[PDB]
Design a protein around this ligand. Structure first.
Ligand SMILES: Nc1cccc(N)n1
Length: 293
């Protein structure tokens, strides 16, 4: 009966956890995204706390509804995601000033959430939403800690591994905020080159793609790595490649920042806060993207 509180409800897409609708709230007239979560009291108390985690680069969580043993999340609506925008920008690429603006904004959103001890864990272009004003916002922040990250979605879609940090792949139990910096570095690279950086199609393909670009990690670059649950001494030993070959034609400011975002050791990996101070952002601006809505 909860859908009678919306004037119209149309399917947008298929999310990690359930159907996503665009909907119009009957009393207020506001247009929202409405996410059904398919199936639990621990998740309700965790999700409800995210209503306070408000920032201009975080998609606003308006309400959490638990009814008829189903959970709905009501979010701020934005018209386009970064996946669609990079597909649409494929012929020319996203201009560097707009890549820079987007990365800057995303780091501000991470810095905010990380300062409140909230992780995303599953960043990907799909969950980065853009508007006509040159803003970009992180969607679904805090949901992975509540519900987990499944292998398959509710519609059997494969949840992407492409943005997953190596410590997760190697079986580390304790996530840190560094996992989100890793994901964002992979997204940065993809905006620049117009081709996913590590498009793995299994846990080992993901891991070995990372290794064949950044080198097989060892105890010199990552103290403790050889004691990780899923580390195997039989991993092939690939050498490290130069970022100049990996993300041309990025500059030495961008290549330096990307390298810090893709450090193997999560304790070495740059923080969102420190990344905001990087010389790459000295000339940052906020351009207008051309959006066809
Ligand atoms: N359009 C849309 C898609 C996902 C999340 C949100 N907030 N809005």
């Amino acid at each position: 009966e909860f859908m009678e509180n919306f004037q119209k409800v149309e399917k947008i897409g298929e999310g990690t956890y359930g159907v996503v609708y665009k909907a119009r709230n009957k009393l207020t007239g506001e247009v929202v995204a409405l996410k059904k979560i398919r199936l639990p009291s621990t998740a309700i108390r965790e999700i409800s706390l995210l209503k306070e985690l408000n920032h201009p680069n975080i998609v606003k969580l308006l309400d959490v509804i638990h009814t008829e043993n189903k959970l709905y999340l009501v979010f701020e609506f934005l018209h386009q995601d970064l996946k669609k925008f990079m597909d649409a920008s494929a012929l020319t690429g996203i201009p560097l000033p707009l890549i820079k603006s987007y990365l800057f904004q995303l780091l501000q959103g991470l810095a905010f959430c990380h300062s409140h001890r909230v992780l995303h864990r599953d960043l990907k272009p799909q969950n980065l939403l853009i508007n006509t004003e040159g803003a970009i916002k992180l969607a679904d922040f805090g949901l992975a800690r509540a519900f987990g990250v499944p292998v398959r979605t509710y519609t059997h879609e494969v949840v992407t591994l492409w943005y997953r940090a190596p410590e997760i792949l190697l079986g580390c139990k304790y996530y840190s905020t560094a996992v989100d910096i890793w994901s964002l570095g992979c997204i940065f690279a993809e905006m620049v080159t117009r081709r996913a950086l590590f498009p793995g199609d299994s846990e080992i393909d993901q891991l070995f793609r990372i290794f064949r670009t950044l080198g097989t990690p060892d105890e010199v670059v990552w103290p403790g790595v050889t004691s990780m649950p899923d580390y195997k001494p039989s991993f092939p030993k690939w050498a490290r490649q130069d970022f100049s070959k990996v993300v041309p034609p990025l500059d030495e400011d961008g290549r330096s920042l990307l390298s810090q975002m893709l450090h193997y050791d999560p304790n070495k990996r740059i923080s969102a806060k420190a990344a905001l101070a990087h010389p790459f952002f000295q000339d940052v601006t906020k351009p207008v993207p051309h959006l066809r809505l």
